[PDB]
């Protein structure tokens, strides 16, 4: 599961995941995940 390009390709995976995490934080579901 280790790659010589994962630490980078993942940086893009997280940056895009932040938009989703904050999306629900707006109160779409509340404190119930």
From Swiss-Prot:
Sequence intervals crossing the membrane: 9-29
Clinical condition linked: Psoriatic arthritis: An inflammatory, seronegative arthritis associated with psoriasis. It is a heterogeneous disorder ranging from a mild, non-destructive disease to a severe, progressive, erosive arthropathy.
Species, as recorded: Homo sapiens (Human)
Site (Cleavage): 8-9, 12-13, 22-25
Localisation: Cell membrane
Protein name as annotated: Tumor necrosis factor
Function recorded in the entry: Cytokine that binds to TNFRSF1A/TNFR1 and TNFRSF1B/TNFBR. It is mainly secreted by macrophages and can induce cell death of certain tumor cell lines. It is potent pyrogen causing fever by direct action or by stimulation of interleukin-1 secretion and is implicated in the induction of cachexia, Under certain conditions it can stimulate cell proliferation and induce cell differentiation. Impairs regulatory T-cells (Treg) function in individuals with rheumatoid arthritis via FOXP3 dephosphorylation.
Gene: TNF
Quaternary structure and partners: Homotrimer. Interacts with SPPL2B.
Superkingdom: Eukaryota
Processing and modification events after translation: The soluble form derives from the membrane form by proteolytic processing. The membrane-bound form is further proteolytically processed by SPPL2A or SPPL2B through regulated intramembrane proteolysis producing TNF intracellular domains (ICD1 and ICD2) released in the cytosol and TNF C-domain 1 and C-domain 2 secreted into the extracellular space.
Similarity annotation: Belongs to the tumor necrosis factor family.
